[PDB]
Amino acid sequence: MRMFRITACVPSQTRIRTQRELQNTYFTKLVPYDNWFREQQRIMKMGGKIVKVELATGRPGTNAGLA
Amino acid sequence: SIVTKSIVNADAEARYLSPGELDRIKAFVTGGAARLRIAETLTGSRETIVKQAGDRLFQKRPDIVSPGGNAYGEEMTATCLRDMDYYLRLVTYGVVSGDVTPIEEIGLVGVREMYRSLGTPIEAVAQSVREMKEVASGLMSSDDAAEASAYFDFVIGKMS
Amino acid sequence: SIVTKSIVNADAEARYLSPGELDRIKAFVTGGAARLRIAETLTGSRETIVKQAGDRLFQKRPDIVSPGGNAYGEEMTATCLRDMDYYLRLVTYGVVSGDVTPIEEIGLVGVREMYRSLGTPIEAVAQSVREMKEVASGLMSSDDAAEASAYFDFVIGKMS
Amino acid sequence: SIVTKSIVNADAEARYLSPGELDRIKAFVTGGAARLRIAETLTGSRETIVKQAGDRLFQKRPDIVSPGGNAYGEEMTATCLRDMDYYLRLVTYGVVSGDVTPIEEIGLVGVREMYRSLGTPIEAVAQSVREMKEVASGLMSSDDAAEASAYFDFVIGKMS
Amino acid sequence: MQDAITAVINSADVQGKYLDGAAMDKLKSYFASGELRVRAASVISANAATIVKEAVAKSLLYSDVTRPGGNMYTTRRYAACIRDLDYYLRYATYAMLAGDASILDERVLNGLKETYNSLGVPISSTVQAIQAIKEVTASLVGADAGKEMGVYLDYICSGLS
Amino acid sequence: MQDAITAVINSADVQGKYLDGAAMDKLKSYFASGELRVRAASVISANAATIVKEAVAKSLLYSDVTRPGGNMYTTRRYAACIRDLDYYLRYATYAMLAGDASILDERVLNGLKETYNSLGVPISSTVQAIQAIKEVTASLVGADAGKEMGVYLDYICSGLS
Amino acid sequence: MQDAITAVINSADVQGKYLDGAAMDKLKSYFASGELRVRAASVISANAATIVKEAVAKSLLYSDVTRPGGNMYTTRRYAACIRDLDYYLRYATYAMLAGDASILDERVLNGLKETYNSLGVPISSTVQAIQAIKEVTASLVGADAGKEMGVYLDYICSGLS
Amino acid sequence: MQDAITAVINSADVQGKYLDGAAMDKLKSYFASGELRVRAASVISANAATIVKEAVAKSLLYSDVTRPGGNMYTTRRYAACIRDLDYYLRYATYAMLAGDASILDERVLNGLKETYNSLGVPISSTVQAIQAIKEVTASLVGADAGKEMGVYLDYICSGLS
Amino acid sequence: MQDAITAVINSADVQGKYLDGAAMDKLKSYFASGELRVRAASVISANAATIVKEAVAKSLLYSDVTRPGGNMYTTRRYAACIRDLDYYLRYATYAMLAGDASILDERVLNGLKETYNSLGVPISSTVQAIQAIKEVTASLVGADAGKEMGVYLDYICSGLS
Amino acid sequence: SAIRTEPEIAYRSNQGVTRQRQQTKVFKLVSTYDKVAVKNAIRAAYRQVFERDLEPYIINSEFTALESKLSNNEINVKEFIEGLGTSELYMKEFYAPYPN
Amino acid sequence: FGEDTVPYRRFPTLPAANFPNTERLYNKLTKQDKELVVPSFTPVVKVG
Numbered sequence A: 001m002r003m004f005r006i007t008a009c010v011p012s013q014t015r016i017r018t019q020r021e022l023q024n025t026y027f028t029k030l031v032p033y034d035n036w037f038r039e040q041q042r043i044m045k046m047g048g049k050i051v052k053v054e055l056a057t058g059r060p061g062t063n064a065g066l067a
Numbered sequence B, C, D: 001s002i003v004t005k006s007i008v009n010a011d012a013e014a015r016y017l018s019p020g021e022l023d024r025i026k027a028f029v030t031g032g033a034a035r036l037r038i039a040e041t042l043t044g045s046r047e048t049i050v051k052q053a054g055d056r057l058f059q060k061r062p063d064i065v066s067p068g069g070n071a072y073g074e075e076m077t078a079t080c081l082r083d084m085d086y087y088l089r090l091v092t093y094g095v096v097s098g099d100v101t102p103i104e105e106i107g108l109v110g111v112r113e114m115y116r117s118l119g120t121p122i123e124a125v126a127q128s129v130r131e132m133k134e135v136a137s138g139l140m141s142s143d144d145a146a147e148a149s150a151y152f153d154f155v156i157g158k159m160s
Numbered sequence E, F, G, H, I: 001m002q003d004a005i006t007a008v009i010n011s012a013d014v015q016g017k018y019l020d021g022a023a024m025d026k027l028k029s030y031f032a033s034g035e036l037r038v039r040a041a042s043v044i045s046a047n048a049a050t051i052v053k054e055a056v057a058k059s060l061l062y063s064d065v066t067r068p069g070g071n072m073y074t075t076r077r078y079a080a081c082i083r084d085l086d087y088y089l090r091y092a093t094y095a096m097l098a099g100d101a102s103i104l105d106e107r108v109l110n111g112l113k114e115t116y117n118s119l120g121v122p123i124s125s126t127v128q129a130i131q132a133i134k135e136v137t138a139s140l141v142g143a144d145a146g147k148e149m150g151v152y153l154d155y156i157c158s159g160l161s
Numbered sequence J: 001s002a003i004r005t006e007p008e009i010a011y012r013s014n015q016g017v018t019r020q021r022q023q024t025k026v027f028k029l030v031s032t033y034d035k036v037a038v039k040n041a042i043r044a045a046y047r048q049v050f051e052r053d054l055e056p057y058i059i060n061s062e063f064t065a066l067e068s069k070l071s072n073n074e075i076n077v078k079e080f081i082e083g084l085g086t087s088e089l090y091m092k093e094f095y096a097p098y099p100n
Numbered sequence K: 001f002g003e004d005t006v007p008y009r010r011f012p013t014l015p016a017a018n019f020p021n022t023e024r025l026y027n028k029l030t031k032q033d034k035e036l037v038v039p040s041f042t043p044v045v046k047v048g
């Protein structure tokens, strides 16, 4: 379905959480294409740095058959 | 191990392994001699225990060894003996460790999927483990029998 | 019903039926005559179909009726046959409706729970359904054989 | 209590309690005798504990009972002793339960907000609990002193 | 929910029997309906926005309903009314292509009267909207297809009232 | 939710009084019963599936409920009933281990009758199934532990009736 | 995660053989060390915050790290350092109690280096703080337990490096 | 929510007319009151905590609610009352600054009755605390600002009743 | 309604069995308590007007309810409070004599909540008045016999909550 | 004050917000190495999303691919929750039989 | 809930009526009834 895999480092800017937090502070996930824009907007607004992103699944510029 | 389970729980709660768990670890480490001794007992008598367990299981469920059943062939029966040997060794591992984490990480997670892919009657396997537990309880002495029976019927319930 | 199936699939996206769904509804409504015909052809042979299928399965897997077995008793043999009859009614329902939705909603969902609770072998019941399908294909017309074997195949694969 | 915590964890996981949790419950039941002894000691020495605790606290922080302080008048001093009695009762509850859960659920959630609304020095309340711990440790056995001092330190840290 | 086909299937199954002659003739009647229903659904999917547009233009449009005080005032409430009409039209098409009102009364009548009352909605104005929907659908689908569509929309109106 | 210890503590707190002799006696009684409850819970955890299986077989098979028309018909409904019985067994074991029925009251009984009436399931058949589970559990655990489990199971039945 | 016990069990299980004399020797050696391990863990739990206090005081306080322009500047970053040192102390205690430094690998070092590089945390200053924590813990818990904690702390600092 | 100005706007727009002389007079009256409203709001924001503290002292402290078993027992619940009184005062200030008590029955009274009934909150005790806050704020801010604040707080009390 | 005897009889009749030893024991317990119940009932009947007098004096007099505009203003309304408190006392005496608080549910709490909510009667003020009644009656009939009266008045208060 | 009879004691023991607010567990997938913890979190996610354990409502688990991806750590628990939401079973259970 | 916590039942204090609505939602077992706990919020002021 032309998913995206992203590595993003999201710091904590308001709260000092006392339990382990690498799993959500520095993570690489697989994001669907439709939700990629919303996810990236959310990450930037939360203040994380998008270290890397790549179209792991799908083919670039597919004029048809992208699902 | 009991220490590993306590560490996991304390980490989940962001704790320092409170005295209610530290005393338990202390008691386990002090009493480990009995657990070790039960370990050598089961290791020494593994062959016989597996043999009577298989005998009782076949008596209760002869169909599994029947040609229609999975255990027929004199090699499927050997494979049942082998799986009982694995389960006995796992129970020994759990007894020496102090908790069921090695038990579930070796032979309980996905056991249903394994026995479905092999066609095996997992409930029959649970009955076989019950027979193994009864044989071991008869072979050992009371409190040791209950200590092993904790892991045994844990495996029984998980298999069921 | 394929009608309700495509209706639900379209409502998931909150839109009317697509050309593909409407075309398949066209085909189903047109072929409903042959579908109902296969309905009678399978509903008329219910006694012989189940008798032959169960009889063949009994020597396919003798463990079902072997001592200590799942259906060793006469009563449990009859109960296994009655399950065969239920599943044949469900396949008749599905073939008439043109969709596996009646199968799913009646006799497939949670069936693994059913047969683990009752200890019955899912692989054996799948083989029984396969015997039903073979006898039905033998005793019905060629095209009707494929049409009914599609839903027999679905139930066999899904349950198994 | 450990019983309620284990039940909550098991229900959240939708499973029966593990052998490790059952052994923990067994150890908790075994230590229940000593915990009951400590709780009975504190309950018997109740009025003493509050009296010397309040006296030592006022000696260390005379301003709170001085004019203009939160606890100047005799009624205000009685209200301090009432709060101290509340926290001693909570500590006895926690000692009985084997965990700080009753203390936290009764008089440690929003304690900072409540004392800020009342204009009470939270550090002064912490010193009061410290004085209570000193009195109890003085009039209690050494090991039971540490057992109760665990809960006292929990309350003190919650105050701070 | 259910349609005619699933209705006959589960009516047989509850008694645990195969398909008797009554079920066979019911299925034959539904199959005979068949292509007529599918054609009506296709034409409705063609002019989906149309029927709602001219239904509004006929009944609600240019009135106190769309005037101040009326519930149609403001573009937000206007578009909400249009969205409601689109819901009603899609459910009508689904119920038509299925043959039963189970889809509607499971996805429409459940709490709809009370929610519209909480919003102070005009039940009469809504009913008139579904009516205009009915005539606009009939004028594009024919006589019998339009009649069955109107029957389903009338069931919707009765549930709404 | 609250075990016996927490119930005693909360009652004493609500009276605003320390743990007197009666509360200490109750806590000592619970401590004495703790080993029994632990062993019974371990046994029931070992034989949970078998208990429900045997109770269903001896109470709720080859009857109208299992037959079409009964609410246990079809794999879906039969699995729902089996899961209901498993829930009853597990929560009764929880109540036995905690020495109090508050967990059943807030996690089981609340809305149980309402949902059963909504879905039309046989409350009487459920009660009989709970009975059969009671005898199976009593046989597996023993006499006194059996009675301790049975009191909570009968409480579940009384609430559900 | 694996302790000495789990390491021995895994070494046996990879060969798929029951425990033997060497396994018993390893298990009894760990049991002998368990007393010291538990005592050191209990003392560190009792005074963990203090240990971080002296470590930060003697390692980073009154330096460029805490001064403006340093990554320990601002209360948020200071609290982040305090919490990170708490992390390191707690996980070092976990590793000491277990007897194996695998919890540090799969729960601390897993992405810690990359996270520090991305956020700008100074690895050298972190290592110095780790050494200070090791020194304080050794002086506080004695010689044998001091070395036991220090080996895991050096493991963490090397993994950071 | 609606204020004194949008209230006039909606009052005109329901009939759809423009803003006539009466509307301008109402807007000018609100603008005249705006100075007092802003001053009272600023003072109330400055002395919010002290106002609720004094009202609690003169209306709730040293009573059955605060005594053990009482609803004000269990310091979490005391903080909950402090927060609830803060909410009431802040939303009363919102209503006074707006000139219309629509926010009070939208963002405040919505579900409050059932909330307190479910939680067993003493409704009359909360009402009395609200009049205590009203008296304290009236004394703090004066006669006219106190007039408006008391009007809105008593509207909240009537909603609770 | 119901009492202790009727409760035992209904408990036996629901399962249709005769009276076993437990039922006779419960009846004997009630008969033993009967002398105390009759004593308390006669005393409360003799001093009914007084009890409400001091309850009103120490719970409601000289307060917002009695002040002009208060719900207890307007002497007809004061007499209504006197009559309502007398009703509560009489029906609490009924419940005490019967041993079962079902007469309160089916003859006092039936619609009383809705009555007070529609009438603007302060529920918490009424509860405080009933508590004062409980204290006065407890002091009048002793601690033991007053315990039952307190239990039933508390039942009334909880139902009115 | 007063005697605090048993009805009042039982009522006041459960007075404010129900104790379920604190008597619960939160499943944070701290590390994917613990396969047992991952499985427990997945089962809890199923329970939260569907209100029930999905044994009597599925022919077979269709979320096996999502479980494998989560255990491999290529998606987070939020992605798992989104996948569970965008499931045929969810629309069957809570979307199909109810209005919008 | 973040990127790692499974969602759990919440007990929000605000906004208004959200606590009672969630309470009514969560105090009923699955499929208990078909009614709507919160069909919509009747606005106090109606625009136009």
Ligand SMILES: *[C@@H](C)[C@H]1/C(=C/c2[nH]c(/C=C3N=C(/C=C4\NC(=O)C(CC)=C4C)C(C)=C\3CCC(=O)O)c(CCC(=O)O)c2C)NC(=O)[C@@H]1C
Residues within 6 Å of the ligand: D064, D069, D070, D071, D076, D077, D079, D080, D081, D083, D084, D086, D106, D107, D118, D119, D120, D121, D122, D124, D125, D128, H061, H062, H063, H066, H067, H072, H073, H074, H075, H078
């Ligand atoms: C001296 C020891 C310190 C001190 C205490 C102090 N407290 C109050 C008043 C109250 N204390 C409480 C506390 C609690 N209520 C609970 O339910 C709980 C446990 C669950 C606690 C801890 C409350 C509610 C009050 C006020 C209401 C009431 O008393 O019933 C006072 C008097 C305050 C006043 O001005 O009225 C005092 C003096 N104050 C100090 O300065 C010392 C540090």
Ligand SMILES: *[C@@H](C)[C@H]1/C(=C/c2[nH]c(/C=C3N=C(/C=C4\NC(=O)C(CC)=C4C)C(C)=C\3CCC(=O)O)c(CCC(=O)O)c2C)NC(=O)[C@@H]1C
Residues within 6 Å of the ligand: I061, I062, I063, I066, I067, I072, I073, I074, I075, I078
């Ligand atoms: C001297 C003139 C006589 C007298 C009067 C007296 N009255 C009270 C107490 C109260 N009087 C009322 C009366 C009313 N409340 C109303 O709403 C109306 C409508 C106008 C009336 C007439 C009330 C309600 C009370 C009690 C409550 C309150 O005062 O707020 C007293 C005091 C009695 C006591 O015990 O407090 C007295 C002295 N008493 C006499 O003996 C004179 C004949």
Ligand SMILES: *[C@H](C)[C@H]1/C(=C/c2[nH]c(/C=C3N=C(/C=C4\NC(=O)C(CC)=C4C)C(C)=C\3CCC(=O)O)c(CCC(=O)O)c2C)NC(=O)[C@@H]1C
Residues within 6 Å of the ligand: A010, A011, A012, A016, A017, A019, A020, A021, A022, A025, G065, G070, G071, G072, G076, G077, G078, G080, G081, G082, G084, G085, G087, G107, G108, G112, G115, G119, G121, G122, G123, G125, G126, G129
């Ligand atoms: C302090 C002596 C040094 C220092 C530290 C520092 N760290 C952060 C932020 C984070 N630190 C971590 C690390 C962990 N989280 C964990 O859960 C664990 C394993 C269990 C570790 C090792 C993380 C994840 C963060 C970011 C997320 C968070 O804080 O929750 C900061 C703040 C950086 C910022 O501004 O965001 C600081 C200052 N910095 C120094 O200069 C010291 C050498």
Ligand SMILES: *[C@H](C)[C@H]1/C(=C/c2[nH]c(/C=C3N=C(/C=C4\NC(=O)C(CC)=C4C)C(C)=C\3CCC(=O)O)c(CCC(=O)O)c2C)NC(=O)[C@@H]1C
Residues within 6 Å of the ligand: B057, B064, B069, B070, B071, B076, B077, B079, B080, B081, B082, B083, B084, B086, B087, B106, B107, B108, B114, B118, B119, B120, B121, B122, B124, B125, B128
């Ligand atoms: C015997 C009473 C029951 C039974 C067992 C049975 N198992 C197999 C084959 C295999 N078993 C495994 C795996 C395991 N067995 C274990 O005990 C464990 C320890 C954790 C594991 C992982 C595997 C992988 C196989 C097949 C390959 C292999 O043996 O290495 C058989 C043979 C099946 C066949 O057709 O080959 C049998 C008979 N089956 C029953 O019906 C009894 C109830």
Ligand SMILES: *[C@H](C)[C@H]1/C(=C/c2[nH]c(/C=C3N=C(/C=C4\NC(=O)C(CC)=C4C)C(C)=C\3CCC(=O)O)c(CCC(=O)O)c2C)NC(=O)[C@@H]1C
Residues within 6 Å of the ligand: C064, C070, C071, C076, C077, C079, C080, C081, C083, C084, C086, C106, C107, C111, C114, C118, C120, C121, C123, C124, C125, C126, C128, F061, F062, F066, F067, F068, F073, F074, F075, F078
């Ligand atoms: C026969 C091909 C296989 C087999 C069957 C078998 N089944 C049972 C018992 C039951 N089977 C069911 C299943 C259903 N009942 C229904 O109404 C439907 C829904 C349409 C289904 C799927 C049930 C409910 C039972 C028990 C109760 C009842 O009979 O109504 C048995 C006997 C179990 C017993 O212990 O009594 C058997 C033998 N067994 C095989 O080995 C074949 C592969």
Ligand SMILES: *[C@H](C)[C@H]1/C(=C/c2[nH]c(/C=C3N=C(/C=C4\NC(=O)C(CC)=C4C)C(C)=C\3CCC(=O)O)c(CCC(=O)O)c2C)NC(=O)[C@@H]1C
Residues within 6 Å of the ligand: E057, E061, E062, E063, E066, E067, E072, E073, E074, E075, E078
């Ligand atoms: C004129 C600048 C442009 C234009 C206008 C146009 N509008 C309509 C019809 C309607 N317009 C509205 C709009 C509103 N009603 C409201 O209450 C609100 C907010 C107060 C709005 C925005 C409505 C409701 C209608 C329908 C009739 C009615 O009001 O009752 C038409 C005619 C449409 C028709 O088919 O009759 C036209 C032409 N068209 C343009 O091209 C201009 C750019």
Ligand SMILES: *[C@H](C)[C@H]1/C(=C/c2[nH]c(/C=C3N=C(/C=C4\NC(=O)C(CC)=C4C)C(C)=C\3CCC(=O)O)c(CCC(=O)O)c2C)NC(=O)[C@@H]1C
Residues within 6 Å of the ligand: E060, E065, E070, E071, E072, E077, E080, E081, E082, E083, E084, E085, E087, E088, E107, E108, E112, E115, E119, E121, E122, E125, E126, E127, E129, J099, J100, K040, K043
């Ligand atoms: C328009 C045809 C008529 C009308 C109605 C009207 N509706 C709303 C608002 C809503 N309508 C619904 C109804 C549904 N939603 C569904 O999902 C379903 C089934 C698919 C139905 C029937 C809902 C839920 C709302 C509120 C939420 C939303 O906006 O989507 C309004 C606006 C009310 C408001 O207070 O703003 C109106 C006016 N009014 C007429 O005059 C027409 C006859």
Ligand SMILES: *[C@H](C)[C@H]1/C(=C/c2[nH]c(/C=C3N=C(/C=C4\NC(=O)C(CC)=C4C)C(C)=C\3CCC(=O)O)c(CCC(=O)O)c2C)NC(=O)[C@@H]1C
Residues within 6 Å of the ligand: F065, F070, F071, F072, F076, F077, F078, F080, F081, F082, F084, F085, F087, F091, F107, F108, F109, F112, F115, F119, F121, F122, F123, F124, F125, F126, F129, J052, K029, K030, K031, K032
């Ligand atoms: C079995 C002994 C009887 C039986 C059971 C049955 N129940 C349902 C459906 C539901 N049962 C419940 C009850 C609970 N769910 C819980 O999580 C708990 C908390 C402790 C309880 C008490 C609920 C909520 C449902 C509906 C949701 C669900 O998916 O299960 C069914 C199926 C009903 C249906 O229409 O699907 C059945 C069959 N039925 C009998 O005939 C037995 C007597």
Ligand SMILES: *[C@H](C)[C@H]1/C(=C/c2[nH]c(/C=C3N=C(/C=C4\NC(=O)C(CC)=C4C)C(C)=C\3CCC(=O)O)c(CCC(=O)O)c2C)NC(=O)[C@@H]1C
Residues within 6 Å of the ligand: H060, H065, H070, H071, H072, H076, H077, H078, H080, H081, H082, H084, H085, H087, H088, H091, H107, H108, H109, H112, H115, H119, H121, H122, H123, H125, H126, H129, J015, J016, J017, J018, K011, K012, K013, K014, K015, K016, K017, K019
């Ligand atoms: C305090 C003087 C009185 C009292 C109150 C009390 N309330 C709660 C809990 C809640 N209060 C609310 C109310 C609101 N939330 C809102 O957003 C609004 C808008 C202003 C209101 C009115 C809610 C929702 C709750 C529950 C949720 C939560 O508490 O977070 C408590 C504590 C309940 C508990 O168990 O913690 C208390 C004590 N009780 C009294 O006895 C006083 C008369």
Ligand SMILES: *[C@H](C)[C@H]1/C(=C/c2[nH]c(/C=C3N=C(/C=C4\NC(=O)C(CC)=C4C)C(C)=C\3CCC(=O)O)c(CCC(=O)O)c2C)NC(=O)[C@@H]1C
Residues within 6 Å of the ligand: J064, J065, J066, J067, J068, J069, J071, J072
């Ligand atoms: C079997 C032929 C060989 C084998 C398999 C094996 N795989 C894993 C673990 C994983 N496999 C996958 C792959 C997928 N997950 C998916 O969802 C899909 C797409 C639909 C694929 C292809 C993943 C992601 C994992 C890790 C997470 C998980 O558990 O799924 C293991 C276990 C590894 C471990 O240590 O846990 C094994 C054993 N092993 C062999 O020896 C065969 C040659």
